[model samples]
Target: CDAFVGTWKLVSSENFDDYMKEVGVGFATRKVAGMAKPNMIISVNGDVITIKSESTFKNTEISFILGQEFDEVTADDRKVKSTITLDGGVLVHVQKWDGKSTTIKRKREDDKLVVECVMKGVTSTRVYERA
Candidate 1:
């Protein structure tokens, strides 16, 4: 948790549009999402972890304990059940909605934060730097 406590700014992303398409995001929404550069702020308190993603288009915040299930509404407005865990130094989030699932992994490498998102075999990777 200590390693992940910081504010990170998006530096680069790969195949994000494809991943969003696989998750059934609409054209207008995807266009807005692709153009908006978001910042992520992560903090930990005792056993709880909170993550906030802020951008001009939309903002989202999530808080949960490790291995606990919680309700989450994705940026595209899909309601899902989500769980997060720490595995091998990476924070892993799994979200399920309507029998489909998406997995996201966040890890710190040196001064950068790397995030990987996967859904229905499509994968996207985004790199961020501390801000």
Candidate 2:
């Protein structure tokens, strides 16, 4: 998880529109989010972990222990519960809301950070470079 600590700038996003639709994001919001350039900031202190995403359209963040469940209001305004853990160098996050589930995984491949998000059966891959 320490390897992910930094400001990460978005390089490209793939199949993001479908992923947002699967997550029940409104069309208006998805339009904004689809074009938004978001940066992810990850940090840690003791047992607490914080992951934040900043963008011109929206900002979202969550703080929690490695295996602790916590409440979060997503960028699209979904109220959910999340539990995050590190599977070696991969950051694995599981989120549940309104009887639906989503998973986000971030890993460093070569020099870039690759983020994959899956909701239902749709997946989005977003690549980022360290800033």
Candidate 3:
């Protein structure tokens, strides 16, 4: 399986603190998302990619071209300029928004896919398994 292609349904997530900070999410929402399980779906063809994050608590979708820069709203609806690239077996994405720059890395660890987001004064990590 081309892990980079096809749709990857989100199974579970851990370490959501950084995700919320980079997204400029509110404390209340962050608290909820921290414990909530969100589903992530991805589609990739050639250099283009589309991703959607869904859950009963929240839902959001984002798309971008590999190595091409663009802007997208965070899970909290904050707009950010970003770009993505594949680093070894990891998809390393960077977001420049909210007057700050952030980098998010997604990779498979063991049998799980993990995401770690980092920015000025904040960082969060979320883990998801292939389903």
Go through the candidates in order and give the C-alpha RMSD of each one to the true structure. 0.7, 0.9, 2.7
TM-score against native, each model: 0.97, 0.96, 0.80
Superposition TM-score, candidate 3 onto the true structure: 0.80
Q: Highest lDDT among the candidates is held by which one?
A: 1
How would you order the candidates by lDDT, starting with the best?
Answer: 1, 2, 3
Off by over 4 Å in 2: none
- Sorted by TM-score, highest first, which candidate order results? 1, 2, 3
| Residues 8-36 of candidate 1: C-alpha lDDT, one tens digit per residue | 99999999999999999999999999999
* Location of the lowest summed lDDT over 10 successive residues in candidate 1: 1-10
Scored by TM-score, the top model is 1
Query: Which tens-of-lDDT digit does each residue in 1-131 have in candidate 3?
Result: 15744345556554466657555678888787677677678876676688887776678888887788887877766687888888787888887764777788888777677777776656666767665
lDDT of 2 by residue, 1-131 (tens): 77888899999999999999989889999999999999999899998988899999888888899888999888988889998888987889899977899999999998899999998789999999998
Off by over 4 Å in 1: none
Clashes of 2: 0
